[PDB]
Amino acid sequence: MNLMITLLTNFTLATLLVTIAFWLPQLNVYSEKTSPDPMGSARLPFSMKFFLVAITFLLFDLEIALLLPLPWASQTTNLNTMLTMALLLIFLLAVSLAYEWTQKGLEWTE
Amino acid sequence: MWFEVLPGIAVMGVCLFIPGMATARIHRFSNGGREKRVAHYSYQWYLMERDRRVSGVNRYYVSKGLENID
Amino acid sequence: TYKYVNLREPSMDMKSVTDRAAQTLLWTELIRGLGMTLSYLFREPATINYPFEKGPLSPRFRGEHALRRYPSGEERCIACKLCEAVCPAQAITIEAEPRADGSRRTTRYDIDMTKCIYCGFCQEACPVDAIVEGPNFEFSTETHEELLYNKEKLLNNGDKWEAEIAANIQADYLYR
Amino acid sequence: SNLTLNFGPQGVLRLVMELSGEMVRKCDPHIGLLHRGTEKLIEYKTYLQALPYFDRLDYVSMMCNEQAYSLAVEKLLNIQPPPRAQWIRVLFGEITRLLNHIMAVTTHALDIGAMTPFFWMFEEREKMFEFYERVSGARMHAAYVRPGGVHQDLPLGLMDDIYEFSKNFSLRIDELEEMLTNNRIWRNRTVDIGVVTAEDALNYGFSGVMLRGSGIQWDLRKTQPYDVYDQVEFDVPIGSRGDCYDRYLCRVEEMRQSIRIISQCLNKMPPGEIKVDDAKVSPPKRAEMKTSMESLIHHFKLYTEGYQVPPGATYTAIEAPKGEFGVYLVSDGSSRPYRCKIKAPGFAHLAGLDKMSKGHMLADVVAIIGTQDIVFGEVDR
Amino acid sequence: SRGEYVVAKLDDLINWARRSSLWPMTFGLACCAVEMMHMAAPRYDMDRFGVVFRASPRQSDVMIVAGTLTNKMAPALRKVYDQMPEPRYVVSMGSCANGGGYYHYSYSVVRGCDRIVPVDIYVPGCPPTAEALLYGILQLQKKIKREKRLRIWYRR
Amino acid sequence: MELLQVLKRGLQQVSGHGGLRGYLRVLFRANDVRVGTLVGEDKYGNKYYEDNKQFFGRHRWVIYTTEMNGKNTFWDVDGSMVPPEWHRWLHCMTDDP
Amino acid sequence: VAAFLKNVWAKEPVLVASFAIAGLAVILPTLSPYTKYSLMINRATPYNYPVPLRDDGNMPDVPSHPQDPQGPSLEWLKRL
Amino acid sequence: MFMINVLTLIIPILLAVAFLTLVERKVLGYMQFRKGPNVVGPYGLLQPIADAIKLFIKEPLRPATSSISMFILAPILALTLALTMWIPLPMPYPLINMNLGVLFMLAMSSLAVYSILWSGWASNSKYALIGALRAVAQTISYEVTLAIILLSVLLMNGSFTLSTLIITQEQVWLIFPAWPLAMMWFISTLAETNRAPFDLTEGFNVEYAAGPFALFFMAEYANIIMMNIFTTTLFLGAFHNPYMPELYTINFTIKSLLLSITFLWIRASYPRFRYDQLMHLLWKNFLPLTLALCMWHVSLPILLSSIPPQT
Ligand SMILES: CCCCCCCCCCCCCCCCCC(=O)OC[C@H](COP(=O)([O-])OCC[N+](C)(C)C)OC(=O)CCCCCCCCCCCCCCCCC
Ligand SMILES: CCCCCCCCCCCCCCCCCC(=O)OC[C@H](COP(=O)(O)OCCN)OC(=O)CCCCCCCCCCCCCCCCC
Ligand SMILES: CCCCCCCCCCCCCCCCCC(=O)OC[C@H](COP(=O)(O)OCCN)OC(=O)CCCCCCCCCCCCCCCCC
Ligand SMILES: CCCCCCCCCCCCCCCCCC(=O)OC[C@H](COP(=O)(O)OCCN)OC(=O)CCCCCCCCCCCCCCCCC
Ligand SMILES: CCCCCCCCCCCCCCCCCC(=O)OC[C@H](COP(=O)(O)OCCN)OC(=O)CCCCCCCCCCCCCCCCC
Ligand code: SF4
Ligand code: SF4
Ligand code: SF4
């Protein structure tokens, strides 16, 4: 309840600040402006590379999602199995990175 | 010279000092002169609810010692 | 008579290779750059307190124009038009006639300070030290035509600034 | 299809980029944004009157362009400056070289992102502008180096201050070089960037560091020497890979060698006059203008008509800090030039910008526009 | 009256905040840019006056035209001036920006930047010294100090 | 310890401007509070100070008057308020006041 | 094994440090004598309740009180 | 009462962000051999107030936007996430004491890229969208090493509790067993906030007016101060006497200010990375060492019998 009140208060303060920033300078009457970029009028071409680094983030973030219960997993009584699977998951994250390296995947966003 | 930056760092340091000082003194005010009860786990919450039940005044921070038993 | 910048071969013993790997992994030259910036943090800055402190100038400085007078009140300018003949910007416009006592004097002496390139050929062409480019550099205006000086403005600049112009010419005329 | 950007004028430069994603396929620099028609205005003004235009071409290399124009006019006049004027010209030419290389290195670091050695080295540049103001009266455009010598003798105590500056300036070069040379981020922005082969550098009309970064052993102060550069002792830095990093190191070492030359010029300044003692070219003293009849006539005729230059064409090139700075001066026998073509190195360098930025990226274009020290005043005239 | 006093104090406050936080957009056209950079250098140091170094044009308070304005770049000058939000100010710096200068009779030079944009402060020189440019910027700040927007608004 | 001498010099800069009142006066009008040898004063109230321990550029300065020619220059200090006999000295065109 | 290692430590020392730290992380727990005590501490941490036994009559090795000698002891955890 | 505690958190955040701009201009003054602001206020103390009033009465830039919703929600999300990263921070006691404050801060810092993405699409400029996508790709790149370094340090903590992270460092700073993690964490938080030498946006929100641009600016500096406080708690955690919390408050305040000055002292020292160079820095330099040290910090509390306590 305290956390929800804190989130509500921070959202309310942010909304009030954006409200002041979009209402206070509008009350100046200065002048209307007539006839209100490097590219002229062209379509943004889709780049393969930005999408590749986005999907690479998504897959390694899933591997991070698997790695996140390790500070709780180190408390177990099957420590040989736990250490084996922890080293196996970090090794599979590293093998994903090595395959992303060696097949020209990290190129011009290296 | 280089000590002219220190009024700004002093004002910024007082502004970083106010939140922790505020929450420490407010926790000692709202909990009967003591720290706020940290209940991350359900056993700690269970003993905290038992405190609130044994105090009689619906306050977990009113302590009852050996004066309450016969 | 020539030297090769950037024609050093790095060593390949284990010592220097480990030195370069320690420089890579421990960021040693980046700490060197942080140390140089930290060194300048604890220096006195070079900042003078303008308007209360002024940058140092010389007596040769070429600022705002002025028309000087002799030590009898007679103005030095005798309308010879050397200064508008040598003016590389053609910022000077002079018209003259004999006045009531027969003296060769100007009726128009205009310097468009927005055309002027402030190079001081007019003061070094002037055979009688009449036009000088004095010490004033703080004469910014809010209007364009305020930087179009006629003879009255330049004579008032001379009357305003003569106490300093004469001392600068006294300090500098032996180099001229 | 491929991308086409217009990095407009929001000096100044318009750039039309044909990109292929991150790469640069074509770089078209639209220039002329500071074309003022200097070398047409020179045609209606006398030689003394055309002198201050040269201050404003390479407006960080003022007394160098003054020196090149003065050498062109003195070559057509068949007269020579006195020795003291020559040592003063070489002294202030190397001070001008320090000015231009501080401007070059610190703005080339400012555009890439290292904004701090800018502020560190413009205090030294402020002190050298005080040297210009003490010698001539203006901080940038002095109109000091004139055909015949210089305008006015050094004020007393100026050389002691040039000594006190030159004694301390190598530590300033050392702390600039501490911030940038071994810095891995500065090396990653300049090592693989704009590699220019020596044959294409000779073919494209490149000059100065743009040649010497590519290993060509050419400096006009050595090979085609002017005023007293055959009497000073200095070394010429030579690159190895033709990239932005070697050109950076060449400019830092040219600051070192300019300090060496300034020390030698302070220790070897001769006594004597500072103008040519032909009063039909250089004006007489003001003490003898106001006493002698011939000197008053010569003062009148030099500051109204000017000296007549004999008819002829010359191409006088000096080693400005940006490279070979040339003046092709055509005289028809009058006291005004018939023609004055101004060769400046930045024009051919900015012409070679398109080859230098092939296969590179968009943030390498600012590094290549930095390694060619491009002042658009000398490019557009 | 009370409301006159209130709008006078409010004019003093907003004039203080607009002159003590000037952000310049500097046109580095020609040699005057070098002396603007000396006005930003550690000796004269614009930043201690609240005058920041190289703000973007869409949030700047003053356009410093520093150098020759040619015919080829006069629409770019007016376009960057039109992109500036109000209150925008223009400082003309040096002779070519002021009246054409040494290129006044040129075919390809706009004879003064006040044929293009409205100019508040004319700083003369070739180039004006960095101390002289700073004098012009402080005179601009004094011109902002005696503005009367809310006093005239209450009187209109 | 030499921090103590730094603190003593700051406290006698407070003492040198005539106390805290003159200290705050020069602090808010000048943005600089260091004391110097009073070299002179013109016919308007501009006071002219030296300190040859400072570096070259700081070693001569002026405190402008509060009222010159009918204008309240308490806050509106102006560079052109210096009369020309002090303009060679203040801009270091000569050594002589 | 000596020229290849020097070549990769001169070219790519980041990868050499990576594979060296990862190799130590793989092989070194199988050589450490302290690794047994990780398991012995984790089995000694009583999250639950030690539910007592019914005494049938023949259990000498189970205590009847916490302060009795027989049973598991943590003197090694104190001393180590 | 609790609302007073929320306000005494979130109002001095905005005041410290206001004066971080002054401290930045002064420190980058004196590190560049000049002075910072000293005319506007006494020692320049009125520079943030004058700056804020200048930005708040400026003419609105009046943009043509692709969306109204994202153009308004991007400053609101930026400020809300900038203020809600402070609530689990132990200083010595947090506002919201929770079991998973580290994972909470990691999640709410991962959510901050929507402000960049929404403000880039909500502008009609294609170059603004390219710069915003490059900034989003940079931020999601360095969030990977944030997560893995954070996981490796919490392998020494014992839980996701931020108050346990003060108990963890009672005998030693946690920069001593984890200084490669600490230096890669420091450069990774430097590259999260688009801070120099990773500030490619100064070498994505050019359509906002001066007010909302100041709001993005102050959310960014709230992130800078917050990540410095979080780095202080996580690697340089101070002594905590429970009877006098002002000792820990003064101590982590001084360390956090020195670390923010270290941000200011790094931006005054280095040129900018080109974009593929810091992509090379993450994916090919920081990430292999981060994975190798993650394996080391898994296997090391087991091989030393130093597994930290669960509670
Ligand atoms: C939290 C408090 C502060 C913490 C410290 C941070 C403050 C200091 C910051 C200094 C300024 C930094 C500014 C930004 C710099 C960014 C550039 C940079 O540094 O790039 C990183 C550079 C990048 O490399 P590079 O670009 O310099 O080199 C060339 C790289 N290749 C070959 C790929 C082209 O280095 C790293 O990535 C190293 C990261 C840290 C490594 C830590 C290793 C510790 C030692 C482990 C053991 C090693 C021995 C071998 C095995 C032994 C086993 C027993
Ligand atoms: C009914 C009656 C009341 C009506 C409403 C008004 C309420 C109070 C509002 C604040 C004060 C208003 C007056 C403002 C100052 C007026 C006088 C002035 O401008 O003095 C100038 C003086 C500096 O003089 P200067 O010319 O700069 O000299 C340079 C020296 N070399 O300036 C100075 O010495 C310092 C000036 C400081 C100005 C005040 C502080 C700023 C405003 C603070 C409150 C608003 C902002 C709150 C925070 C915003 C978000 C961060
Ligand atoms: C068994 C231990 C645990 C192993 C698994 C865990 C690993 C943790 C770290 C994860 C790393 C993820 C990414 C790995 C990528 C490796 C491949 C690679 O990078 O190859 C390319 C590289 C040459 O680079 P190039 O492609 O040319 O790039 C141009 C740049 N100028 O090629 C090279 O530079 C050569 C790289 C391969 C050889 C490295 C040898 C290091 C040896 C260190 C000492 C022994 C360590 C123990 C392991 C046995 C090694 C044989
Ligand atoms: C957690 C703490 C956070 C603190 C944040 C703020 C830190 C800095 C605080 C300010 C420090 C001192 C500032 C002094 C400014 C100068 C005052 C002054 O003298 O202004 C003069 C001006 C004109 O006066 P005039 O009548 O012309 O007098 C000439 C005499 N011949 O007269 C005026 O301008 C009128 C008076 C205006 C006074 C304004 C003072 C500054 C207000 C800043 C807003 C924030 C205040 C603190 C809020 C939080 C703490 C409670
Ligand atoms: C585009 C729209 C506008 C965008 C701006 C506003 C939204 C974005 C910024 C705010 C984000 C809000 C995130 C809300 C949940 C945060 C996670 C959380 O609550 O974790 C803390 C805690 C878990 O720790 P633990 O210690 O186990 O709990 C106490 C038990 N001893 O858990 C608890 O203590 C549980 C407390 C009660 C549950 C709290 C739930 C809050 C309301 C739901 C989310 C509201 C926001 C929805 C939109 C999100 C963004 C799209
Ligand atoms: S200084 Fe030069 S441009 Fe100016 S009026 Fe004199 S001669 Fe003409
Ligand atoms: S100012 Fe001098 S040069 Fe010009 S017309 Fe007068 S006397 Fe002749
Ligand atoms: S007024 Fe003169 S010095 Fe200034 S920019 Fe123009 S040409 Fe250059």
d(CA D212, CA D219): 8
> How far, in whole angstroms, is CA H68 from its chain's centroid?
28
- Written as six digits, the tokens of D134 are 């003490």
Q: By the 8 A CB rule, do E61 and E87 touch? A: yes
Ligand nearest to the CA of B43: 5
Q: Would you say how long chain D is, in residues?
A: 381
Residue H138 in contact with partner chain B when CB distance is under 8 A: no
For β-strands D14-19 and D3-7, DSSP reports them as antiparallel
Closest CA in chain C for residue E93: C140
D245 and chain C in contact, CB less than 8 A: yes
Atom of ligand 5 nearest to the CA of H88: 21
How far from chain centre, in Å, is Cα E35? Answer: 15
Q: Which of H291, H292, H307 sits opposite G42 (nearest CB)?
A: H307
Query: What's the burial of E90, exposed, middle or buried (CB within 10 Å: 0-12/13-18/19+)?
Result: buried
3 state SS of H238: coil
Ligand 1 pocket by C-beta < 6 Å: which residues? C 24-25, 27, 30, 34; D 184; G 12, 14, 17, 20-21; H 180, 182-184, 186-187, 197, 231, 235, 266, 270, 281, 285-286, 289
d(CA D357, CA D354): 5
Count the Cβ atoms, other than its own, within 10 Å of residue G70.
11
Strand partners, D326: D317, D343
**Site to substitute for ligand 6 among C113, C121, C157, most atoms within 8 A of C-beta:** C121
Question: Residue F54 class from Cβ within 10 Å (0-12 exposed, 13-18 middle, 19+ buried)?
Answer: middle
The owner of tokens 């600012």 is D366
CA C92 to ligand 7: nearest atom: 4
Sequence letter at residue F18: G
Mutate to test the pocket of ligand 2, among H35, H46, H47 (most ligand atoms within 8 A of CB): H46
- Report which bound ligand comes closest to the CA of D58: 8
DSSP state of D269: P
Chain H residues whose beta carbon lies within 8 Å of the beta carbon of residue F29: none
- Contact at 8 Å (CB) between H306 and G31? no
Resolution in A: 2.9
Contact C112 E99 (CB under 8 A): yes
Experimental method: cryo-EM
Q: Which domain holds residue B46?
A: 1-70
d(CA H23, CA C41): 13
Distances (CA, A) of E81 to D6, D10, E26, E117: 19, 10, 11, 7
Cis peptide before D283 (omega within 30 of 0): no
Alpha helices in F1-95 (DSSP H): 3-16, 20-30, 84-90
Alpha helices in chain B (DSSP H): 6-29, 42-54
* Cβ pair F79:E135 closer than 8 A: yes
Could you give the angle at the alpha carbon of A66 between the alpha carbons of A64 and A70, nearest 5°?
Answer: 90
CB pairs under 8 A between B and H: 108
Alpha helices in chain H (DSSP H): 2-30, 47-56, 69-83, 101-110, 113-121, 126-157, 164-167, 179-192, 210-235, 246-267, 275-281, 287-303
H214: contact with A, CB 8 A cutoff: yes
Which residue's alpha carbon is nearest to atom 6 within ligand 7?
C77
d(C-alpha G37, C-alpha C150), whole Å: 99
Cα distance between residue H123 and residue H205, in whole Å: 8
Beta-bridged to residue C94, according to DSSP, are: C109
DSSP state of B4: G
Please tell me which residue of chain G has the smallest CA distance to H307. G38
Cβ separation G22–H301 shorter than 8 A? no
Closest by CA position to D33, among listed A54, E27, H218:
E27
Instruction: Return d(Cα C158, Cα C169) in angstroms, integer.
Output: 13
The verdict on a CB contact (< 8 Å) between E86 and A31 is: yes
CB contact set of D76 (below 8 Å; sequence gap of 6+): D309, D310, D312, D314, D329, D331
In sequence order, what DSSP letters do the residues of chain C get, joined into one string?
-EEETT-PPPP-SHHHHHHHHHHHHHTHHHHHHHHHHHHHHTS------TTTS-----TT---SEEE-B-TTS-BS-----HHHHH-TT--EEEEEEE-TT--EEEEEEEEETTT-----HHHHH-TTS-EEE-S-----BSSGGGGEE-HHHHHHHHHHHHHHHHHHHHHHGGG-
Q: Which residues pair with E63 in a beta bridge?
A: E25, E90
| 8 Å CB contact between H232 and H182 | no
Are the beta carbons of H183 and C30 separated by less than 8 Å?
A: no
Partners of D4 in the beta sheet? Answer: D18
What's the DSSP call for residue H283? I
Looking at the DSSP bridge assignments, the partners of residue D328 are D315, D341
Neighbours of D254 (CB within 10 A): 27
**How many whole angstroms separate alpha carbon E129 and alpha carbon C138?**
9
**C82 contacts D222? CB cut-off 8 A:** no
Please check whether residue H149 is in contact with residue H187, taking contact to mean a CB–CB distance below 8 angstroms. Answer: no
Question: Which two three-digit tokens encode residue H38?
Answer: 């000293």
Please tell me the total count of domains within chain B: 1
- CB-CB contact of D22 with D360 (8 Å): no
Domain ranges of chain A: 1-110
- Find out whether D241 and D195 touch, Cβ atoms under 8 Å: yes
Closest CA relative to residue D116, chosen from C27, C36, E46: C36
Ligand 1 atom at shortest distance from the alpha carbon of G15 = 33
- Smallest CA–CA distance, residue H83 to chain B, in Å, is 13
